[PDB]
Design a protein around this nucleic acid. Structure first.
Ligand SMILES: [Mg+2]
Ligand SMILES: [Mg+2]
Ligand SMILES: [Mg+2]
Ligand SMILES: [Mg+2]
Ligand SMILES: [Mg+2]
Ligand SMILES: [Mg+2]
Ligand SMILES: [Mg+2]
Ligand SMILES: [Mg+2]
Ligand SMILES: [Zn+2]
Lengths: 143, 95, 134, 101, 66, 50, 67, 149, 55, 197, 123, 213, 130
RNA sequence: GUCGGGCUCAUAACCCGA
RNA sequence: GUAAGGCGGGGGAGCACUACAAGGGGUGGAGCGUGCGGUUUAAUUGGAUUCAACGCCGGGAACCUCACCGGGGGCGACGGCAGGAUGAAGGCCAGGCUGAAGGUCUUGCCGGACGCGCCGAGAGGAGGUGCAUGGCCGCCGUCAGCUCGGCGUCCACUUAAGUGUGGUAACGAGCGAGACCCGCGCCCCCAGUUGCCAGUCCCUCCCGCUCGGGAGGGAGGCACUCUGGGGGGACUGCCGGCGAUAAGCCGGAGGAAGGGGCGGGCGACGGUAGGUCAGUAUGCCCCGAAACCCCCGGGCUACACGCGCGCUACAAUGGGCGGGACAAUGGGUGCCGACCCCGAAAGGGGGAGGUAAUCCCCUAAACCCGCCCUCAGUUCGGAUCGCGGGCUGCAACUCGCCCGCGUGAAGCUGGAAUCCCUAGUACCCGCGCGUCAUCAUCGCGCGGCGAAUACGUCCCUGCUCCUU
């Protein structure tokens, strides 16, 4: 009954790892958050992912669609207090990066100071730029 | 605005064609007449001139041909400063 | 009758007390049979293990140690225990064996750290920065 | 009774022992008990400061220090002794404090 | 180098050829008889004068003084 | 330095000062006549002139 | 392999930077067994040591008058 | 026998198992989603991590007198991995310790000294010393040197 | 009034809230155990306060 | 605590003394000492000519106490003038006397020789004067005079030699003076005698 | 106190003397309130004792303030011949109008004579 | 891990309480008075020797082995390829850890071979000690590199350092640990096997020393 | 996706909220700054924006206070902000509320680099000073 | 041959990398 | 021209981990913290450039600091002039200009003598000059020199040393070295609170049920530790061998300690036109209604690039989770905050005791035991960015610090070159003070754990003496 590749919520994940570490392959889940959803779905976080039957994948995917309505606190979600509505949302692989893209386009529309630094590709959180952050290539005077 | 040795009185601009040695430098002036400049005593110690750098000089009206005298020098900060205002034209350096 | 002695090792003072008994020895309340870093348990056992299963089973010792660290307290306890065992019994064929083996079990160690000087001053007296010509 | 408690403190350690000994005398000449001068830990204050006015040269420092010595005395409350300890004429750099317990 | 100092010798001689029978070959006797015959107020300085006097009394009592 | 001290509503036969006093200080110090309020002059009052 | 020798006298410090020492050794088994020769050693040496050497006929070049 | 006669961690392991019978000790319902301090990085891995912390706090006021919360936070602190900067010590949180002491107090094992902290009652001394004796009785079967005392 | 534009502002924290008692400068001021002096004025008047340089 | 009391009363003396230097430069200020009795203190000022410090019938002293009570602490001050104990062993005074003789117009080699002669007459062991400024030229110089024994390095030359410094402003610039004296009862450690019978 | 181009009455010389010479002696002893537009208010309160109003002010608008107001107070006053002497009697060197004072010290006999003279004479 | 081995109580003065140095035998007459094999229950002397000339002669050999692995590796000389700069995760002043790895090495050596572990170590530190070398000599003006002889104390020091460094490379970024890489080095040296590091270094020293006689 | 909503509230809806029920919908910085009150200069600026909003003050609004927090009273009008030398027009739109006022007026000019000069490398230092 | 870094108080000569 | 002896790729002797030799750890290659040169700007304020410039000017700058850029507004003791009690200098309710302002103006009141519209002078100046000075400081150098009433100060040997002993046209001296001062390690006397608890005695509680063992209080005592005033102890003194038998040097006993006992303070006559006029003092030259004094907003925090000093790593000589162990220096009234309650955390509300051996900061980390990971760009590494919650402050966008969830860059051991260290030292690990309203990858100190090698040479890099 063992399976070598299981597919849960989009991406398919390994079958010879501990369930808590196979769920990290999803972009939008870390190790602190995967432990929570294994403890809420009610199954051990040390079992090998390949032993997941179908009902358990269904429960996991359900918990991934609204974590607050199942027991996860609301200080432990991906983005709390959504900008369009005051809900508490946790987003994953394909809809997470679209949110960040729109969050940067908003700052670029009004021409804020933090959206222009995104335009130019320069440091945004106030670092110093004389000695580090050197991504370009050398220049000379003469030899 | 700025403290630059622009033309003040009877000034000239020095762009040397060749150094023969012994204090004589020959400049390719827009005049056409080859001016053979010399050196005073105050600049032969603290500053240091070479070939190809625009400098300032003072001529003497004697024949208005072989004359000239440096009294101050130009930096690298100013060589391209004296171009945007159009005070001097660069094409006489390349033609 | 009872006796009491002293031992010191780099900011670690130890006070021991000996008397007639059954053979049990406690250090701060812990029996020496239960001390975890074995390299520290074998240090406080030599003065006893070198005197035999005979003198060991006629005394009760208890040491009060404070200061220093887990290895600077074991040697303080050892000095205290040897200095006490050499007085209770009062025989010198035992003081002989305590000096062929280790002379400091009975005279002590006078070494302390050295004040640091100013070039880094937070690394040591003689550690300095890194020179740089050019 | 009432075990008055005198507390001296000073920087010159020589100019302290003589006041302590005056009090020791005054107690001995009379009939009254006294707890000998109890030494409390010295309180040295220390200040490190760079030695040059500008910033050139290697950096070398100073270590200035000021030490302050303290004592403690208990004594029974007798007018024959209290009166005598009131004309004792402390020197200038000696600070004295009395308070009944 | 444990070189003897200049004023140690200069006094250790001056009070050995002035009282040439008041110093024996013993160290601890000299140390006392030195502290009372001079105004030395240090302690490392009377130890060294006592040592030099001992070395003088053991050389002049055996033979050739140099 | 010119001359300006007049128009106190003062005549001959009798005198009736035009601007009243400032209650804050005693008598003597007069009032202002801006046209909407009575301004002290050096005290502090905006009682909306009577 | 190798015949041993016993160090009985030191002569001083040779070496381009003061590292080797010249000594006088006495062989004690093999073809010679008793001849006294001179050799150079690298390291700290006492009297009474026992070196292990592999040639027994080299006779280190004499030192500059020991001084 | 007392708790001075045995190794501490084997005792804590044995005491935690007994603590699962007192119906007053039960983990708060925000326990599956927390870590124990700002100096840690990941959440506790064993499922009964509550019982170990409680049973370590009980043995902790037994042999350290009247003690309060802000001193049990310095014991349960540690070193931090704060990125590119050098390591540094920090205290621990408070709720995990406060709930533990309140639940122990409701069990009867500790109590409150007015203005000094918390002590252990005769009932708690009985509880710990009995288990310590039960542990030592089976630790003389392998080290026959603990027989003496 | 013309007496409102030569008058300072009363800071109470910052480098401009403490100045040397003897020189009058802002910056490197010792504030240990009360004393309030430049690091330059202390070093030249410490022997008269009673400090000594033992070690 | 207590150290804050011990070093709050050492700064008041320092400020009062440093003000009195400037104020009483002439007539030769020597030094002071405060005595704190109940209900008030007692200030003593060892000048060298009480005539200038007291005033005309004592009208300078009124101003002095008014300042010493308003601009400094000293809730109830009482001044009285004195005379220096030994003016020729107090280098901090000879520095000022040489400085004044300079800025009055005397050559810088008569001043120093006269001063050294007086100090070594009144019974000192040895003296050292060092005058360094723009004397005789436009480039600075420095000269040095000395007479007898004088320790320089070590603990005995930190407690036994008395030393002072003073400026002598002139028409061209300043000139620094530095004097140092060793009193006639010194006794270095090097000096031992044989207590004989 | 208007210009002499105002026929109020005649002016004698004795009161002039013993009232213009009444100021210096009262100046070295009291508190002086010079000028006109200053003590108009003090006499509005009525505190100034011996006011001394002259006849020199021109033009005739700011000139008659007290003669309309003398009829409501006690106004112990005189008339003054000219101005320079009034500036010299107290204060400064300008053309003065009414140098009124309070508390004439040592100068009360002249008060009792000529002040009550001018009181009983006219008002 | 078994409590009978976690709480260990010795009753006798043997080295580390487990093995006895009575029938070990130093065959080499040169390295006889420098290999110390006296009773010495515990091997830790708190560095009281490195103050007197020729002092480290009376220090038990097991302790010299323990002191010479409290290092990081090769920090200014490449050893078998690379540098081995291990900062902040080296056992530079941790003696407890070095003591444990030497104890575990000895427990593995006693099992694969079946002999007293110190007999094997004393065999190994004689096959790794070289007896010829090379240096320079200044004389009249020039130099030229020659052959010299090695004194026995230096032989012992070089042998021990070479065993330490040879064992300290087989455990670098490899699946093998350090307690067992320290046993695989000793077992291999005492067999005069080429795969060693300490034995090969003696061969390559003696060879290029003979080349220049 | 056509109207602007901040937390589910439209503009004219979040416009008549008070200053304490709104600050629950702002980030932590803005809430704390609104809770310690407006500084007197921001009070003089708000006193002048509420005139320009009702009927009066047809005259360009200028300010130095780069710390003002864009609030739903200021949506529509164009104010000028001092960037160190000039007053820069910053028209206020929804999606600006919450942000600081200086966040839309830059203070340093963009740097477009030239060519290294003498001393820029270790090969041009000692061959040029003579 | 070109840019960059090393060695020297600094330039030449010399060593290394792109 | 802005104040008319030393050296030599010569010879001897002697030294030093900022020299080598024998060793331990690294830097140089990747990312970031910070200082510098250079480019950019309205300004990105200045000084320092081999050792001896570059976490240096105690320089961790949000306002102030501040010297820089854009704007606004103030100040001439004192002499003598225009004018001035018919009222000089000066102050304000409301409203305009304004970033905001009785600063100016509209509007009318007030105060009672002076008077920058004028002339001379004067305060004040982080304005020039450190190449006009004083004071202070770094380097030759803690080297052995520099001189007085060419020699003496040279030669042989000796010393850390111009430190000593002999021979000497030399004999006597001074300052520097030494002596001197502060700590550390061993023993004794006097002291016993706020420090200490061993032996006796009362009282309560717990365990194998108590014969034994343990834990807290109060009665008592200075026994031990400690605190700090005074004393002792070590002198080449004793034994053996070199050297003359003298100066001295090697080895050993006894000793807590051994050959300046170990670690620090104190830097001669002079030079370096070395640094500082931007710590204070000061001559000359310049600004003097401005280069002086204040207030608002920007800047020193910009970023194709070359360099210095560091922090974190490239994994098993480890990462994570849960348990268990042991310090010292210092600081506290504008401040330290035990103890109870609220929160998941940062944090929030009450609040004893402390002006100090009395109460607080203050149950350190590396280390040990159990389980998961198994050589992989990973359960290594933690830059970079999104959303949300807090603290200090009059003010956090430029441009502060802290917390939770998410994202997951280069990096798989480093070319030529090059630095620091000789014993409780170097390496590894955390802590306290300074600066401080808030902010430590820094300076200065503290303890924890604890080695390898050599007791030597003048080969390289330097310095001191005699000679040529
Ligand atoms: Mg080159
Ligand atoms: Mg600023
Ligand atoms: Mg200079
Ligand atoms: Mg010299
Ligand atoms: Mg210069
Ligand atoms: Mg800066
Ligand atoms: Mg990780
Ligand atoms: Mg900010
Ligand atoms: Zn100052």
């Amino acid at each position: 009954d063992f399976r070598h590749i299981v597919r849960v919520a989009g991406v398919d994940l390994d079958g010879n790892k501990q369930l808590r570490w196979a769920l990290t392959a999803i972009k939008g889940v870390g190790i602190n958050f995967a432990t929570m959803v294994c403890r809420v779905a009610g199954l051990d976080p040390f079992m090998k992912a390949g032993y997941l039957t179908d009902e358990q994948v269904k429960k996991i995917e359900e918990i991934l669609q609204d974590p607050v309505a199942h027991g996860i606190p609301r200080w432990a979600v991906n983005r709390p207090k959504d900008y369009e509505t005051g809900r508490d949302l946790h987003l994953i692989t394909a809809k997470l990066d679209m949110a960040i893209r729109e969050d940067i386009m908003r700052l670029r529309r009004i021409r804020a100071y933090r959206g222009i630094r995104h335009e130019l590709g320069l440091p945004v959180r106030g670092q110093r730029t004389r000695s580090n952050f050197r991504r370009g290539q050398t220049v000379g005077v003469s030899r | 605005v700025i403290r630059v040795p622009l033309p003040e009185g009877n000034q000239l601009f020095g762009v040397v064609e060749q150094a023969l040695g012994a204090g004589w430098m020959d400049v390719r002036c827009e005049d056409g007449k080859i001016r053979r400049c010399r050196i005073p005593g105050k600049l032969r110690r603290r500053v240091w001139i070479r070939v190809g750098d625009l400098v300032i000089v003072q001529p003497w009206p004697v024949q208005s041909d072989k004359r000239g005298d440096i009294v101050y020098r130009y930096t690298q900060t100013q060589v391209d400063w004296l171009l945007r205002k159009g005070k001097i034209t660069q094409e006489f350096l390349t033609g | 009758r009872i006796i009491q002695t002293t031992g010191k090792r780099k900011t670690a003072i130890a006070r021991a007390v000996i008397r007639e008994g059954k053979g049990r020895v406690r250090i701060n309340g812990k029996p020496v049979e239960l001390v975890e870093p074995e390299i520290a348990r074998f240090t406080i056992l030599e003065p006893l293990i070198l005197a035999g299963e005979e003198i060991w089973n006629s005394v009760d010792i208890d040491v009060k140690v404070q200061g220093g660290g887990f290895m600077g307290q074991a040697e303080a306890a050892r000095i205290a225990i040897a200095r006490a065992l050499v007085e209770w019994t009062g025989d010198m064929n035992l003081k002989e064996k305590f000096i062929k083996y280790d002379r400091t079990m009975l005279v002590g160690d006078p070494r302390r750290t050295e004040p640091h000087k100013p070039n880094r001053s937070t690394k040591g007296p003689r550690a300095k920065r890194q020179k740089s010509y050019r | 009774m009432q075990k008055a408690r005198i507390k001296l403190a000073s920087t010159n350690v020589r100019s302290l022992e003589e006041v302590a000994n005056q009090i020791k005398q005054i107690a001995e000449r009379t009939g009254v008990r006294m707890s000998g001068p109890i030494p409390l830990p010295t309180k040295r204050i220390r200040i490190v400061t760079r030695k040059s006015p500008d910033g050139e040269g290697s950096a070398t420092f100073d270590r200035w220090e000021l030490r302050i010595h303290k004592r403690l005395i208990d004594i029974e409350a007798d007018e024959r002794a209290m009166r005598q300890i009131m004309r004792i004429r402390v020197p200038e750099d000696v600070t004295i404090e009395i308070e009944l317990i | 180098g444990k070189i003897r100092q200049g004023f140690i010798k200069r006094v250790a001689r001056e009070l050995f050829n002035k009282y040439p029978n008041e110093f024996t070959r013993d160290f601890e006797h000299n140390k006392k008889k030195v502290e009372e015959l001079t105004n030395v107020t240090s302690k490392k300085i009377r130890n060294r004068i006592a040592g030099y006097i001992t070395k003088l009394v053991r050389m002049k009592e055996e033979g050739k003084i140099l | 330095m010119g001359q300006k001290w007049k128009l106190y509503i003062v005549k001959d036969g009798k005198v009736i000062r035009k601007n009243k006093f400032c209650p804050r200080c005693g008598p003597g110090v007069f009032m202002a006549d801006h046209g909407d309020r009575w301004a002290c002059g050096r005290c502090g009052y905006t009682e909306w002139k009577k | 392999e190798g015949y041993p020798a016993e160090v009985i006298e030191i002569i001083g410090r040779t070496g381009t930077t003061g590292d080797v020492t010249q000594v006088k050794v006495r062989i004690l088994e093999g073809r010679d067994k008793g001849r006294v020769i001179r050799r150079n050693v690298r390291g700290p040496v006492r009297v009474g040591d026992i070196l292990i050497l592999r040639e027994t006929e080299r006779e280190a070049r004499e030192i500059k008058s020991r001084r | 026998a007392t708790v001075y006669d045995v190794p501490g961690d084997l005792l804590v392991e044995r005491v935690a198992q007994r603590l699962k019978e007192i119906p007053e000790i039960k983990p708060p319902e925000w326990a599956p989603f927390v870590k124990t301090g700002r100096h840690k990085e990941r959440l506790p891995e064993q499922e009964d991590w509550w019982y170990y912390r409680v049973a370590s706090i009980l043995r902790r006021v037994y042999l350290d007198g009247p003690v309060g919360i802000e001193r049990l936070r310095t014991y349960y602190g540690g070193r931090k991995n704060r990125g590119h900067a050098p390591e540094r010590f920090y205290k621990a949180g408070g709720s995990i310790i406060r709930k533990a002491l309140q639940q122990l107090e409701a069990a009867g094992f500790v109590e409150k000294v007015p203005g000094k902290g918390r002590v252990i009652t005769p009932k708690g001394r009985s509880f710990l010393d009995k288990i310590a004796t039960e542990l030592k009785k089976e630790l003389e079967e392998i080290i026959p040197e603990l027989k003496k005392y | 009034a013309k007496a409102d534009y030569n008058k300072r502002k009363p800071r109470k924290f910052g480098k401009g809230a403490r100045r040397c008692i003897r020189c009058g400068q802002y910056g490197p001021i010792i504030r240990i155990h009360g004393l309030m002096l430049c690091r330059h004025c202390f070093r030249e008047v410490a022997p008269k306060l009673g400090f000594r340089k033992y070690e | 605590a207590i150290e804050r009391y011990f070093i709050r009363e050492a700064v008041k003396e320092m400020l009062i003394d440093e003000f009195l230097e400037k104020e009483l430069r002439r007539a030769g200020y020597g030094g002071l000492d405060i005595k704190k009795t109940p209900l008030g203190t007692k200030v003593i000022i060892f000048a060298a000519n009480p005539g200038y410090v007291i005033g005309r019938g004592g009208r300078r002293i009124r101003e002095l106490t008014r300042i010493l009570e308003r601009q400094f602490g000293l809730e109830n001050p009482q001044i009285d003038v004195q005379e220096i104990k030994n003016p020729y062993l107090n280098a901090k005074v000879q520095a000022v006397r040489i400085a004044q003789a300079l800025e009055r117009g005397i050559h810088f080699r008569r001043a120093a020789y006269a001063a050294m002669r007086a100090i070594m007459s009144n019974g000192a062991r040895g003296v050292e004067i060092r005058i360094s400024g723009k004397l005789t030229g436009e480039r600075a110089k420095s000269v040095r005079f000395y007479q007898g024994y004088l320790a320089k390095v070590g603990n005995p030359a930190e407690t036994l030699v008395s030393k002072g410094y003073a400026q002598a402003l002139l028409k061209l610039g300043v000139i620094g003076v530095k004097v140092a004296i060793m009193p006639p009862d010194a006794r270095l450690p090097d000096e031992i005698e044989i207590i004989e019978k | 106190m208007a210009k002499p181009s105002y026929v109020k009455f005649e002016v004698p010389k004795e009161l002039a003397e013993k009232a213009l010479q009444a100021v210096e002696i009262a100046r070295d002893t009291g508190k002086i309130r010079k000028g006109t537009n200053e003590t108009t208010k003090a006499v509005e309160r009525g505190q100034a004792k011996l006011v001394i109003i002259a006849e020199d002010v021109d033009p005739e608008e700011i000139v008659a303030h007290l003669p309309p107001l003398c009829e409501e107070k006690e106004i112990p006053y005189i008339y003054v011949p000219s101005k320079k002497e009034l500036g010299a009697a107290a204060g400064i060197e300008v053309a003065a109008a009414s140098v009124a004072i309070i508390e004439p010290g040592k100068a009360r006999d002249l008060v009792e004579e000529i002040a009550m003279k001018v009181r009983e004479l006219m008002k | 891990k078994p409590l009978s081995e976690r709480f260990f109580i010795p009753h006798e003065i043997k080295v580390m309480g487990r093995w006895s140095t009575e029938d070990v035998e130093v065959r080499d007459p040169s390295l006889k008075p420098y290999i110390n094999l006296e009773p010495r229950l515990l091997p830790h002397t708190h560095g009281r020797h490195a103050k007197k000339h020729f002092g480290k002669a009376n220090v038990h050999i097991v302790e010299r082995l323990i002191n010479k692995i409290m290092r990081s590796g090769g920090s200014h000389y490449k050893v078998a390829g690379h540098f081995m700069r291990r900062e902040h995760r080296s056992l530079n002043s941790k003696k407890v850890k070095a003591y444990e790895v030497v104890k575990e090495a000895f427990k593995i050596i006693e099992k694969r071979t079946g002999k007293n572990p110190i007999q094997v170590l004393v065999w190994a530190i004689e096959n790794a000690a070289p007896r010829e070398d090379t240096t320079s000599v200044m004389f009249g003006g020039i130099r030229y590199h020659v052959a010299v002889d090695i004194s026995p104390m230096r032989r012992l020091d070089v042998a021990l350092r070479n065993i330490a460094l040879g064992a300290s490379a087989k455990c670098y970024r490899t699946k093998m640990s350090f307690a067992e890489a320290l046993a695989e080095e000793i077992i291999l040296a005492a067999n005069k096997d080429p795969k060693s590091y300490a034995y090969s270094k003696k061969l390559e020293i003696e060879r290029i020393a003979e080349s220049s006689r | 996706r056509k109207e602007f909503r901040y937390r589910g509230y439209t503009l004219e809806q979040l416009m008549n909220m008070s200053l304490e029920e709104l600050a629950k919908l702002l980030p932590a910085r803005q809430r704390r700054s609104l809770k310690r009150g407006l500084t007197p200069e921001q009070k003089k600026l708000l006193r002048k924006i509420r005139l320009a909003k009702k009927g009066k003050y047809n005259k360009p609004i200028r300010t130095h206070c780069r710390d003002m927090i864009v609030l739903p009273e200021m949506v529509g009008l164009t104010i000028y902000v001092h960037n160190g030398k000039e007053f820069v027009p910053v028209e206020i739109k929804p999606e600006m509320i919450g942000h600081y006022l200086g966040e839309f007026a830059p203070t340093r000019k963009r740097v477009q680099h030239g060519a290294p000069g003498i001393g820029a490398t270790r090969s041009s230092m000692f061959v040029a000073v003579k």
